Amino acid sequence: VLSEGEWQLVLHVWAKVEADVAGHGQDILIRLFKSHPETLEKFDRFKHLKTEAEMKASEDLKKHGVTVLTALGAILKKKGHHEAELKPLAQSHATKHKIPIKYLEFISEAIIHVLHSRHPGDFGADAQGAMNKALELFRKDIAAKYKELGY
Ligand code: HEM
């Protein structure tokens, strides 16, 4: 489990993200889609986007970026007790969206990359390690529910 100190590092940089949820959301999804094209195919709404420029110009994509980061933010603030927030997400992503745990690892990588680019001063090695731990916890817990459902 994460220590109190680790959670503080996570929430300190996350407070910076919430200052511009929409901007971060775009960068993260675009990074995810460009680095792992198979993830873009999971979105009927975004399949038509064939270039980074098209992705950046999509208001709909920007809208989803906010939805994603807002859900993640709520989870992170619950620290070591995010059971309630995780249940709905795990269910929909396992049964409706069909998102393998591997894709969650991909988006975790996208999140860390963007945080480094936008907040280097509050995202040094210690903070980076802490965020990695928090995102690993997120994945592990979702994985547990996936195994439960048999996905
Ligand atoms: C940080 C990790 C993620 C969070 C917090 C997150 C959160 C959400 C939320 C809140 C919704 C809308 C409500 C719902 O359907 O449950 C959603 C929808 C969706 N997510 Fe995620 N998601 C994450 C990662 C992913 C990944 C990695 C993929 C695909 C590779 C994905 C694919 C989808 C799809 C396809 C939908 C449905 C979109 C629609 O029909 O409009 N999500 N996600």
Side-chain angles (χ1 to χ4, degrees):
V1 309
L2 281 77
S3 66
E4 168 53 39
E6 290 171 333
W7 280 123
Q8 189 159 34
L9 294 176
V10 169
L11 298 180
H12 182 73
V13 68
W14 201 258
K16 306 289 183 179
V17 175
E18 299 196 335
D20 178 23
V21 180
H24 285 81
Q26 295 175 298
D27 292 349
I28 292 172
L29 290 174
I30 290 177
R31 165 55 64 130
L32 174 69
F33 296 156
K34 290 310 186 175
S35 299
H36 308 274
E38 70 268 42
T39 65
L40 178 61
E41 196 66 16
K42 288 290 178 175
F43 291 91
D44 286 339
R45 285 162 62 187
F46 312 130
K47 280 185 181 63
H48 71 280
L49 305 169
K50 308 298 180 183
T51 73
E52 181 163 6
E54 286 173 4
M55 292 176 182
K56 293 181 186 298
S58 176
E59 189 64 9
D60 194 40
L61 186 48
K62 188 174 180 174
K63 174 184 293 180
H64 193 59
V66 169
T67 294
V68 175
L69 294 192
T70 55
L72 181 58
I75 293 166
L76 296 177
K77 292 172 189 178
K78 282 299 183 189
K79 299 157 72 177
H81 315 102
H82 57 213
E83 301 84 10
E85 296 68 28
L86 206 153
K87 294 188 177 184
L89 187 166
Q91 296 185 4
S92 72
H93 289 63
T95 71
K96 186 185 180 183
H97 313 319
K98 312 292 186 62
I99 310 306
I101 296 295
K102 189 69 178 180
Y103 290 16
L104 294 187
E105 181 193 16
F106 296 156
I107 203 174
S108 292
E109 299 185 307
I111 291 165
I112 294 170
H113 184 91
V114 174
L115 290 185
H116 179 86
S117 302
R118 291 176 165 254
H119 316 292
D122 292 290
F123 208 58
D126 301 325
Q128 182 184 350
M131 182 60 72
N132 179 52
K133 291 190 64 62
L135 297 180
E136 289 181 307
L137 179 66
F138 168 72
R139 291 205 295 288
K140 187 176 67 66
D141 290 346
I142 290 178
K145 292 174 180 168
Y146 274 20
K147 192 179 188 299
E148 179 184 313
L149 294 172
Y151 174 62

